[PDB]
């Protein structure tokens, strides 16, 4: 009975989520699924066996518009938004 | 037959029929309205019970020695008795 | 007379649609069930005459509306509607016995005689095939559609080729109304059949055939809950092939488009288990726990009629908060965060025992581990935490309430 009184838990019982909590949850879930995401691995999976050299194909030119169209082509292949390719390549 | 009115030389009857297919039909100038489906097979005759304010029933007899009382207002079975040597 | 019946049909269809669009939880069902019994009575009135070539166009249309509305309201088919279809077909034949298969063969030969009711028949085939796809009669479905198209298409034992090959015959000219039409049914058939073919091939272990049919789900009618489920299903396919980065794509898409993000967070937990990302796995399950706290139909055949209930083996099975909180605490304890695991276990066990007043926390059945095994896992976590007095109280409680589990009880009582 003292055993029971020591066992009796509290913040066990929880009810409904404020509908903004659903979006926060889903936000943090997509954040998590992208944090453990990698593009190198994607380029080894979809395309068969990354730097500006990769997308521009072996030091062709250094023209800004040319490199933009290369990122568009790459992103079209992988189904990733162009932003994240740009980010990954630049950080590498 | 339930009612007979006379617009001109012609005339206008509201008449109940019933069928080989266990159906009860209303008619007004030969306009079919308010069909019911009878439980039992091979109906024989129908009579009419008033029974108070507006609770009008068509009582249908069968060759199967059974009988239904269907509402008027809502062509809809109210009772289904059986064995019924006779009905009055 | 046909005038009046037709008018009645039209009136009732329009009433149904009005309840579909407008209305409350109560009033919707009221007008629907009202129209429903209108249609019954009309059926019976029409079923009260012999044959009538000119009536059949309605009879078939009306029985279609009746079946549709019946099924829609019930949120499922029955065999009553099989017999409704059987009756209408018997009637079609009686114009000019054994079973549905011979009936349909004779009926479709009698349609190649060109009575102009094909726009109803094809609808009726749609409905028949919806019954056989809910009741798993895919071989007879194939046979029917093989008979419908040229039987020269006999070796095409793929359904998802026959269903595409199957051509509804008209634009559905000024005939009686309908709640649905041949194409509006065929487009639900293709998606439901392809979705089902995909899930069978996945669980059966061919996540190479799956991807074809699971993209054929999204390339045609796909209500958005059908697309969320197609995406979790592709996450599973790619994880089983060893492409976790592609699986992540489709699960993120399912998170975004869904208000139902159970089946994706579960696929993610399994993915992080496959890789070893144990902290991430336990975070994905914490979020699933939080996602299962937070929680309309149409007088019309949708696609959520012709899906099954998920198997336990499927990627689309999600348990209860309790079942999954146990998965979290189990998977936390095996990893060696006994403190976290123990906390989770006490917050599980209080939810099962202290729950008399609120709605009863879900309890595991034969597949689920027996209650005493849960007490044991709880005491083990407690010990690993260094909560020995609490483990003692647990074991004492269990033995006071009531073999191997008793001997083990004494064991853990000792280690405490």
GROMACS .gro file of N, CA, C and O in nm, chain C residues 95-143:
model
  196
  275UNK      N    1  -3.635  -0.978  -6.977
  275UNK     CA    2  -3.671  -0.905  -7.102
  275UNK      C    3  -3.657  -0.998  -7.224
  275UNK      O    4  -3.750  -0.999  -7.307
  276UNK      N    5  -3.544  -1.069  -7.233
  276UNK     CA    6  -3.510  -1.160  -7.346
  276UNK      C    7  -3.485  -1.302  -7.293
  276UNK      O    8  -3.417  -1.381  -7.362
  277UNK      N    9  -2.995  -1.658  -6.385
  277UNK     CA   10  -3.053  -1.785  -6.332
  277UNK      C   11  -2.952  -1.855  -6.239
  277UNK      O   12  -2.984  -1.876  -6.120
  278UNK      N   13  -2.837  -1.892  -6.295
  278UNK     CA   14  -2.739  -1.981  -6.229
  278UNK      C   15  -2.660  -1.900  -6.126
  278UNK      O   16  -2.675  -1.927  -6.005
  279UNK      N   17  -2.582  -1.803  -6.173
  279UNK     CA   18  -2.484  -1.729  -6.091
  279UNK      C   19  -2.435  -1.603  -6.161
  279UNK      O   20  -2.461  -1.587  -6.283
  280UNK      N   21  -2.364  -1.519  -6.086
  280UNK     CA   22  -2.322  -1.385  -6.134
  280UNK      C   23  -2.238  -1.400  -6.261
  280UNK      O   24  -2.259  -1.319  -6.353
  281UNK      N   25  -2.153  -1.501  -6.269
  281UNK     CA   26  -2.060  -1.513  -6.383
  281UNK      C   27  -2.138  -1.539  -6.513
  281UNK      O   28  -2.119  -1.461  -6.609
  282UNK      N   29  -2.229  -1.638  -6.517
  282UNK     CA   30  -2.306  -1.673  -6.640
  282UNK      C   31  -2.402  -1.559  -6.674
  282UNK      O   32  -2.422  -1.532  -6.794
  283UNK      N   33  -2.465  -1.502  -6.570
  283UNK     CA   34  -2.553  -1.384  -6.581
  283UNK      C   35  -2.480  -1.277  -6.661
  283UNK      O   36  -2.533  -1.236  -6.764
  284UNK      N   37  -2.364  -1.233  -6.611
  284UNK     CA   38  -2.284  -1.125  -6.674
  284UNK      C   39  -2.247  -1.163  -6.818
  284UNK      O   40  -2.258  -1.076  -6.902
  285UNK      N   41  -2.208  -1.288  -6.844
  285UNK     CA   42  -2.171  -1.333  -6.981
  285UNK      C   43  -2.290  -1.311  -7.075
  285UNK      O   44  -2.274  -1.241  -7.178
  286UNK      N   45  -2.407  -1.365  -7.037
  286UNK     CA   46  -2.533  -1.357  -7.115
  286UNK      C   47  -2.577  -1.211  -7.130
  286UNK      O   48  -2.621  -1.174  -7.240
  287UNK      N   49  -2.567  -1.133  -7.023
  287UNK     CA   50  -2.606  -0.988  -7.016
  287UNK      C   51  -2.520  -0.909  -7.115
  287UNK      O   52  -2.577  -0.827  -7.187
  288UNK      N   53  -2.390  -0.932  -7.117
  288UNK     CA   54  -2.297  -0.852  -7.201
  288UNK      C   55  -2.311  -0.895  -7.347
  288UNK      O   56  -2.294  -0.807  -7.433
  289UNK      N   57  -2.350  -1.020  -7.376
  289UNK     CA   58  -2.392  -1.062  -7.513
  289UNK      C   59  -2.522  -0.990  -7.551
  289UNK      O   60  -2.530  -0.938  -7.664
  290UNK      N   61  -2.618  -0.983  -7.459
  290UNK     CA   62  -2.746  -0.910  -7.478
  290UNK      C   63  -2.723  -0.758  -7.489
  290UNK      O   64  -2.814  -0.693  -7.540
  291UNK      N   65  -2.609  -0.704  -7.443
  291UNK     CA   66  -2.569  -0.561  -7.459
  291UNK      C   67  -2.508  -0.539  -7.598
  291UNK      O   68  -2.535  -0.432  -7.658
  292UNK      N   69  -2.434  -0.637  -7.650
  292UNK     CA   70  -2.377  -0.636  -7.789
  292UNK      C   71  -2.489  -0.652  -7.893
  292UNK      O   72  -2.464  -0.626  -8.012
  293UNK      N   73  -2.611  -0.689  -7.850
  293UNK     CA   74  -2.736  -0.669  -7.930
  293UNK      C   75  -2.777  -0.521  -7.937
  293UNK      O   76  -2.868  -0.493  -8.016
  294UNK      N   77  -2.716  -0.432  -7.859
  294UNK     CA   78  -2.733  -0.283  -7.856
  294UNK      C   79  -2.873  -0.238  -7.811
  294UNK      O   80  -2.940  -0.161  -7.880
  295UNK      N   81  -2.917  -0.279  -7.690
  295UNK     CA   82  -3.002  -0.194  -7.607
  295UNK      C   83  -2.919  -0.077  -7.552
  295UNK      O   84  -2.813  -0.099  -7.493
  296UNK      N   85  -2.970   0.044  -7.572
  296UNK     CA   86  -2.905   0.169  -7.529
  296UNK      C   87  -2.939   0.193  -7.383
  296UNK      O   88  -3.035   0.268  -7.352
  297UNK      N   89  -2.863   0.122  -7.302
  297UNK     CA   90  -2.851   0.138  -7.156
  297UNK      C   91  -2.706   0.111  -7.112
  297UNK      O   92  -2.685   0.089  -6.992
  298UNK      N   93  -2.609   0.120  -7.205
  298UNK     CA   94  -2.468   0.079  -7.180
  298UNK      C   95  -2.410   0.168  -7.071
  298UNK      O   96  -2.324   0.121  -6.995
  299UNK      N   97  -2.448   0.296  -7.072
  299UNK     CA   98  -2.398   0.400  -6.979
  299UNK      C   99  -2.437   0.367  -6.835
  299UNK      O  100  -2.374   0.423  -6.744
  300UNK      N  101  -2.541   0.285  -6.818
  300UNK     CA  102  -2.585   0.230  -6.688
  300UNK      C  103  -2.516   0.096  -6.661
  300UNK      O  104  -2.470   0.075  -6.547
  301UNK      N  105  -2.514   0.007  -6.759
  301UNK     CA  106  -2.449  -0.126  -6.747
  301UNK      C  107  -2.305  -0.109  -6.704
  301UNK      O  108  -2.263  -0.181  -6.614
  302UNK      N  109  -2.232  -0.025  -6.775
  302UNK     CA  110  -2.089   0.001  -6.748
  302UNK      C  111  -2.075   0.054  -6.606
  302UNK      O  112  -1.979   0.015  -6.536
  303UNK      N  113  -2.167   0.140  -6.566
  303UNK     CA  114  -2.173   0.189  -6.427
  303UNK      C  115  -2.188   0.069  -6.335
  303UNK      O  116  -2.114   0.061  -6.234
  304UNK      N  117  -2.283  -0.018  -6.368
  304UNK     CA  118  -2.317  -0.139  -6.290
  304UNK      C  119  -2.195  -0.233  -6.283
  304UNK      O  120  -2.170  -0.289  -6.174
  305UNK      N  121  -2.118  -0.245  -6.391
  305UNK     CA  122  -1.992  -0.325  -6.394
  305UNK      C  123  -1.895  -0.266  -6.294
  305UNK      O  124  -1.830  -0.343  -6.223
  306UNK      N  125  -1.880  -0.134  -6.299
  306UNK     CA  126  -1.803  -0.056  -6.202
  306UNK      C  127  -1.840  -0.098  -6.062
  306UNK      O  128  -1.750  -0.130  -5.983
  307UNK      N  129  -1.969  -0.102  -6.033
  307UNK     CA  130  -2.019  -0.131  -5.896
  307UNK      C  131  -1.991  -0.277  -5.861
  307UNK      O  132  -1.943  -0.301  -5.749
  308UNK      N  133  -2.019  -0.369  -5.952
  308UNK     CA  134  -1.992  -0.514  -5.933
  308UNK      C  135  -1.845  -0.530  -5.893
  308UNK      O  136  -1.817  -0.596  -5.792
  309UNK      N  137  -1.757  -0.471  -5.974
  309UNK     CA  138  -1.611  -0.480  -5.959
  309UNK      C  139  -1.568  -0.415  -5.826
  309UNK      O  140  -1.472  -0.466  -5.765
  310UNK      N  141  -1.637  -0.312  -5.781
  310UNK     CA  142  -1.613  -0.250  -5.648
  310UNK      C  143  -1.643  -0.353  -5.538
  310UNK      O  144  -1.562  -0.365  -5.444
  311UNK      N  145  -1.752  -0.429  -5.551
  311UNK     CA  146  -1.785  -0.537  -5.454
  311UNK      C  147  -1.677  -0.644  -5.453
  311UNK      O  148  -1.629  -0.677  -5.345
  312UNK      N  149  -1.643  -0.695  -5.570
  312UNK     CA  150  -1.542  -0.802  -5.582
  312UNK      C  151  -1.403  -0.752  -5.541
  312UNK      O  152  -1.325  -0.836  -5.497
  313UNK      N  153  -1.374  -0.623  -5.550
  313UNK     CA  154  -1.243  -0.570  -5.504
  313UNK      C  155  -1.244  -0.546  -5.353
  313UNK      O  156  -1.136  -0.554  -5.293
  314UNK      N  157  -1.359  -0.518  -5.292
  314UNK     CA  158  -1.371  -0.513  -5.144
  314UNK      C  159  -1.368  -0.655  -5.083
  314UNK      O  160  -1.316  -0.670  -4.970
  315UNK      N  161  -1.416  -0.756  -5.157
  315UNK     CA  162  -1.434  -0.897  -5.113
  315UNK      C  163  -1.332  -0.993  -5.177
  315UNK      O  164  -1.354  -1.116  -5.169
  316UNK      N  165  -1.230  -0.940  -5.246
  316UNK     CA  166  -1.106  -1.013  -5.284
  316UNK      C  167  -1.140  -1.125  -5.384
  316UNK      O  168  -1.114  -1.242  -5.350
  317UNK      N  169  -1.198  -1.091  -5.498
  317UNK     CA  170  -1.242  -1.186  -5.603
  317UNK      C  171  -1.185  -1.141  -5.737
  317UNK      O  172  -1.258  -1.132  -5.838
  318UNK      N  173  -1.054  -1.122  -5.734
  318UNK     CA  174  -0.978  -1.048  -5.837
  318UNK      C  175  -0.976  -1.131  -5.966
  318UNK      O  176  -0.984  -1.072  -6.075
  319UNK      N  177  -0.973  -1.264  -5.955
  319UNK     CA  178  -0.978  -1.356  -6.071
  319UNK      C  179  -1.110  -1.347  -6.147
  319UNK      O  180  -1.106  -1.348  -6.273
  320UNK      N  181  -1.223  -1.337  -6.076
  320UNK     CA  182  -1.357  -1.324  -6.140
  320UNK      C  183  -1.369  -1.182  -6.197
  320UNK      O  184  -1.436  -1.170  -6.302
  321UNK      N  185  -1.312  -1.081  -6.129
  321UNK     CA  186  -1.311  -0.939  -6.174
  321UNK      C  187  -1.246  -0.935  -6.313
  321UNK      O  188  -1.312  -0.888  -6.409
  322UNK      N  189  -1.125  -0.991  -6.324
  322UNK     CA  190  -1.045  -1.005  -6.448
  322UNK      C  191  -1.131  -1.067  -6.557
  322UNK      O  192  -1.126  -1.020  -6.672
  323UNK      N  193  -1.201  -1.173  -6.521
  323UNK     CA  194  -1.280  -1.254  -6.617
  323UNK      C  195  -1.392  -1.170  -6.676
  323UNK      O  196  -1.413  -1.174  -6.798
   0.00000   0.00000   0.00000
